[PDB]
Design a protein around this nucleic acid. Structure first.
Lengths: 87, 1027
RNA sequence: UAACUUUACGUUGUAGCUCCCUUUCUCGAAAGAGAACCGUUGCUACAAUAAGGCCGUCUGAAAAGAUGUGCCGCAACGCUCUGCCCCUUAAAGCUCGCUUUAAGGGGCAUCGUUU
């Protein structure tokens, strides 16, 4: 159940994201937002190399920070979902 | 149970419908029902912006300000926890106390003197807050600033701001909507690194590595741009192979799939036909993308080498397909200097596929060197981990790709390829798909049309056929619509000028020269004083003569149905007596190339006819079938899509196979003119005209015109039934034909007796489904919307009816000049402002184009007066900016009606009250302000709630009103109601202002259907909560 | 089409400097000047920048008020879930025609999707 930056995409799947549709809206909205934000951040956590202004160490500094932020966000989301009681 | 044809007239703001009963031979025999539905077009009427623009702008601004505030808060946290901050300096939910008010002077003086720990946080926060730029004025300003920096002594942008930036114009930050004082973020990096280095040089226990790292992270922190949906970016599974994950939109095979799918259905358009690529053409265009990047519309054309006779299904210049991954990998290999500029990529497709999967599944250096170390050469991994980033996932697995791609290369179509490897009819129309309809107005119009169709099918049954007619204004952009309106106005003005010219030649012609003789004279002018066919000459005696000249179709109507404006010509008295239904190709001996044809070609070759008409002199064996089929149908996107959708997705109990007839516009006008038929109720007229244009009527019309084309009448045009122009007018307007002064029948009994009296010879004029027409309007019961006006006002003097607002001089007028807050505390300034204002007659733009100066007592000048705060009345408002500002109330969103003592009270409910959940308790009383409003308690009975565009009825002592409630005036307590059809002869533009709801005998809100029927009263039970 | 990183503005409040300024205090050379509580022109800094809802964490019994390296908040479309209204059939009874419960069909949303 642990989320790590190496086995991350095996958990952040479309099936996992769509399993959240049963929760009540007051709970459904926050976890879905967290999941969406984490997925987007992971998907866009490497455009810093495509831009030539983020030169040298800033590029992988931003990459590492973004990956850690995304994995922490989905850890929080999955913890909230676990508290709500889904598998 | 009932066989009928349903006719629709679809506009951008209304939809008219009619039903015509038919016999077994598709001939109208009755007029069952008709109606009109009205809504608001899905755009801003004033300008033309989409309905979802302000929401998008507000959302973007909210996100921007939230991100900036969070960045500043994180800067504060980093400066406190990762360095010397003396956290006793941070108090409560506040900030660094006694913060210096001049960061700009400090940031330019940090290289010649130490900065206090209280003077370091200020400059750091200032740098983080205004972090510059990473569309012409902005770019020009930053370019000019960059040029200025590298010319003089401007080592820091702060020094530039302090030295030459403020001493000229008297300001540092930009004012108004200008763009001069903008800076680049790279220059801010340079200034920041110079600050840190040259300030650690002097001393200070700060300037550790953590400070530099944090400030550089915060200064170059920009969120990555979002694109597409979010489900598409996740690793799902395969629809065909439920054992393997998806593939990225970066691999060789997936992009091969995309290329083949896009290439198969190119559909090269040859002059309007369908000309697909054959085997030999697709064998060359296939490899071009993979060799060059920008393959545009014309790039393939050069390989095709056509001669403008083959379009595509300049301005038409867009990349039909682009090599993203292939050229990205090529550039990543090239920029490291280990590959030539233009050479094939020395890598197998399997290798590129695997690196794409690895790059799209993992985003960390360690993992990418954990899966690519054993497959690519040592240099390749490092070269890829410098300029490469991929995303997105396709819905087709890698395993299925190896099977799908070869078949699509073999020429097999997508569907059959995936079928070999591995839209039922319903009663009601399904929702209109928004994928193909990329237009809001068209989508809304089709949705309303679908609602009407579903309603009529529910009430009566499945229609036999649907005849669709769309106005020329639908499916067009706003600018084209405006051009159409201006062209119509210009045409009307030109017609009036031509009429004025006409009133000179023959004043004795009755007393009203009409447009028919105008057209005759104009077409005479086209011939340039010459005659056609006969070959005689002008200087005939009387232009009309009642028989001398007859407008006739060059190409016969019975074969072309092509009235238009080109076909009609005017001839002289001689000839034309033995023409018949013969085109000039079979009448003037043109087939054998005789003189009777060449002579008349020479005669008409000097005419002023239009190009289309001039080249319509001769038609070499034109298709005598499709032509009449082309003028009887519509060839636009919306009509074709409607035909296809209603043909496939619902059931039509017809006889043939093409049981959807989209008619033209000129044919409808021809039919309405022939059959007699010459406010917001005329939409049903074209609906009835359209649903009677069956193929049997076309057959009878062709027979009649062919018989009359030979002058063989040795009788009027055929009509659907006797007494057509009368029954339709009575059913629509409830009045006799062409009598705007007659009384109107708005009841079943009145309409029925009028029909029985004026049409006693037609027993079919009455039936159990006759009802006076009632226009229906689209309801709008949303409780969301704006919270208040954009501007906000000071609320210090809110005990009275006072509120202060700062307005610029260029916008202030003489009306607000007498309401200035400081009117008596400085007399000379007010007199000077009046003198400047009372010079150009209330023209502020031309009066304050020159600077204003508060002149000191006994002479001299002082600093400018760029803006002045004036005083405005304010009896109520909305508290915003954390109880620091007052704003005007938003648009009314609900009204609550209470009844006591045979008197009615209105309680207004706005959007902000709904948001906060505070339902009101004060009913509006005319004159008195809110504090003196009648309070609501348990002794007030609740009747109903009114939303905009709701059917209401009042019964006052003078008359009875039945309309659609539109707005409620809180200053008087009187509601406004629009008349159902918006008749220009009732009230002011169809509205009844100042209706007295109070002391009315009766007042109740009605409910209406979507077809204008089922008008019943509704009694709401209990007050609904705001949230 | 529909959306997406930002930047520079505008308005409100507070603080600093600054110009006009209507009363009231402080005077022997009549002119003015000084200090104040208010208004207000301009420059800079800071906070807010829809009104507000959800979810997690703190003080805790009447409730907050803060807090978060999280989303939604002026739109479009639709009826699987929830609500309002209207219309049929049913169990009924009214009091001598309105409600209670319903099953079904619709319209609109405080409901659902996209944002």
């Amino acid at each position: 159940m642990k989320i790590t930056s190496s086995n991350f995409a095996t958990i952040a799947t479309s099936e996992n994201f769509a399993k959240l549709s049963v929760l009540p809206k007051n709970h459904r909205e926050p976890i879905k937002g967290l999941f969406k934000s984490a997925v987007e951040q992971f998907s866009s956590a490497r455009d810093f190399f495509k831009n030539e202004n983020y030169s040298k160490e800033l590029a992988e500094k931003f990459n590492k920070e973004a990956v850690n932020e995304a994995v922490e966000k989905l850890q929080k989301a999955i913890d909230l979902a676990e508290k709500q009681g889904i598998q | 149970s009932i066989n009928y044809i349903l006719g629709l007239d679809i506009g951008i703001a209304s939809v008219g419908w009619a039903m015509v009963e038919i016999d077994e031979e598709e001939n109208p025999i009755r007029l069952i029902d008709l109606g009109v539905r009205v809504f608001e077009r899905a755009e801003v009427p004033k300008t033309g912006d989409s309905l979802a623009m302000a929401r998008r702008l507000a959302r973007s601004v909210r996100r921007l300000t939230r991100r900036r505030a969070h960045r500043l808060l994180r800067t504060r946290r980093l400066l406190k926890r990762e360095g010397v901050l003396q956290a006793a300096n941070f108090d409560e939910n506040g900030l660094i106390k006694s913060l210096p008010n001049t960061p700009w002077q400090l940031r330019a003086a940090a290289l010649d003197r130490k900065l206090t720990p209280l003077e370091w946080s200020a400059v750091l926060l200032h740098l983080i807050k205004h972090r510059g730029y990473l569309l012409g004025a902005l770019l020009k300003g930053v370019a000019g600033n960059a040029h200025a920096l590298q010319t003089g002594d401007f080592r820091t942008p702060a020094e530039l701001a302090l030295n030459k930036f403020e001493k000229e114009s008297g300001h540092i930050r930009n004012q108004r909507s200008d763009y001069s004082h903008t800076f680049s973020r790279k220059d801010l990096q340079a200034e920041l690194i110079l600050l840190f280095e040259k300030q650690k040089e002097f001393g200070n226990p700060h300037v550790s590595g953590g400070l530099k790292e944090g400030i550089e992270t915060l200064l170059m922190t920009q969120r990555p741009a979002l694109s597409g949906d979010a489900v598409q970016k996740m690793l799902g599974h395969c629809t065909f192979e439920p054992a393997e994950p998806k593939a990225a939109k970066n691999t060789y095979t997936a992009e091969r799939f995309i290329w083949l799918t896009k290439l198969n259905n190119l559909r090269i358009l040859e002059q309007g036909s369908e000309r697909p690529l054959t085997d030999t053409e697709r064998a060359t265009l296939m490899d071009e993308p993979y060799r060059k990047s920008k393959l545009t519309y014309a790039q393939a054309r050069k390989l095709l080498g056509l001669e403008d006779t083959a379009f595509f299904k300049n301005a038409e210049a867009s990349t039909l397909m682009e090599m993203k991954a292939y050229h990205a990998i090529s550039r990543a290999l090239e920029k490291e200097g280990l590959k030539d500029k233009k050479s094939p990529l020395n890598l197998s497709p399997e290798l590129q596929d695997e690196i794409g999967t690895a790059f799209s599944l993992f985003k960390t250096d360690e993992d990418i060197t954990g899966r690519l170390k054993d497959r690519i050469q040592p240099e390749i991994l490092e070269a890829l981990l410098k300029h490469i980033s991929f995303d997105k996932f396709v819905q087709i697995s890698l395993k299925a790709l190896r099977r799908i791609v070869p078949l699509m290369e073999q020429g097999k179509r997508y569907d059959e390829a995936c079928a070999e490897i591995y839209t039922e009819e319903k009663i009601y129309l399904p929702p209109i798909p928004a994928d193909e309809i990329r237009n809001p107005v068209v989508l809304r119009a089709l949705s309303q049309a679908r609602k009407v169709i579903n309603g009529v099918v529910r009430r009566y049954g499945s229609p036999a056929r649907i005849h669709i007619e769309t106005a020329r204004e639908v499916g067009k952009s706003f600018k084209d619509r405006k051009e159409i309106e201006k062209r119509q106005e210009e045409n009307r003005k030109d017609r009036e000028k031509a009429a004025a010219k006409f009133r000179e030649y023959f004043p004795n012609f009755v007393g009203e020269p009409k447009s028919k003789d105008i057209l005759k004279l104009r077409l005479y002018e086209q011939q340039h004083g010459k005659c056609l066919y006969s070959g005689k000459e002008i200087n005939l005696g009387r232009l009309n003569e009642k028989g001398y000249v007859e407008i006739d179709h060059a190409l016969p109507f019975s074969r072309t149905w092509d009235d238009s404006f080109n076909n009609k010509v005017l001839v002289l008295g001689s000839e034309n007596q033995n023409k018949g239904n013969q085109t000039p190709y079979e009448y003037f001996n043109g087939k054998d190339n005789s003189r009777e044809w060449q002579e008349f070609k020479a005669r008409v070759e000097t005419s002023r006819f239009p190009r289309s008409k001039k080249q319509r002199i001769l038609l070499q064996k034109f298709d005598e079938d499709g032509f009449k089929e082309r003028n009887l149908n519509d060839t636009r996107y919306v009509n074709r899509f409607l035909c296809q959708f209603v043909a496939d997705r619902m059931r039509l109990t017809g006889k043939g196979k093409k049981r959807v007839f989209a008619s033209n516009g000129q044919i409808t006008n021809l039919l309405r003119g022939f059959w007699g038929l010459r406010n917001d109720r005329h939409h049903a007229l074209d609906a009835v005209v359209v649903a009677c244009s069956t193929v049997a009527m076309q057959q009878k019309i062709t027979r009649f015109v062919r018989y009359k084309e030979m002058n063989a009448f040795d009788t009027h045009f055929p009509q659907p039934w006797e007494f057509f122009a009368q029954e339709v007018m009575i059913r629509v307007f409830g009045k006799p034909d062409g009598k705007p002064e007659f009384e109107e029948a708005d009841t079943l009994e009145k309409l029925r007796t009028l029909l029985a009296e004026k049409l006693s010879s037609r027993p079919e004029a009455v039936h159990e489904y006759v009802t006076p027409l009632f226009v229906s309007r689209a309801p709008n019961r949303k409780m969301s919307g704006q919270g208040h006006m954009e501007t906000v006002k000071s609320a210090k003097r809110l005990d009275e009816g006072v509120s202060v607002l700062r307005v610029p001089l260029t916008q202030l007028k003489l009306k607000d000049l007498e309401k200035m807050v400081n009117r008596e505390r400085e007399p000379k300034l007010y007199e000077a402002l009046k003198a400047r204002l009372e010079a150009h007659k209330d023209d502020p733009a031309k009066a304050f184009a020159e600077p204003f100066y508060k002149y000191d007592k006994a002479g001299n000048r002082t600093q400018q007066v760029k803006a002045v705060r004036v005083e405005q009345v304010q009896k109520t408002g909305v508290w915003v900016r954390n109880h620091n500002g007052i704003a005007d109330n938003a648009t009314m969103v609900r009204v609550d009606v209470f009844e006591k003592g045979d008197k009615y009270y209105l309680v207004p409910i706005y959007s902000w009250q709904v948001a906060k959940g505070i339902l009101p308790d004060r009913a509006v009383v005319q004159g008195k302000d809110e504090e003196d409003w009648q309070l609501i308690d348990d002794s007030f009975n609740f009747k109903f709630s009114l939303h905009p565009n709701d059917l209401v009825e009042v019964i006052t002592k003078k008359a009875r009103m039945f309309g659609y409630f539109a707005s409620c005036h809180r200053g008087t307590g009187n509601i406004n109601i629009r008349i159902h059809d918006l008749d220009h002869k009732i009230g002011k533009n169809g509205i009844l202002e100042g209706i007295g709801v109070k002391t009315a005998l009766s007042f109740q809100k009605y409910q209406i259907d979507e077809l204008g029927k089922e008008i019943r009263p509704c009694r709401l039970k209990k007050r609904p909560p705001v949230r």
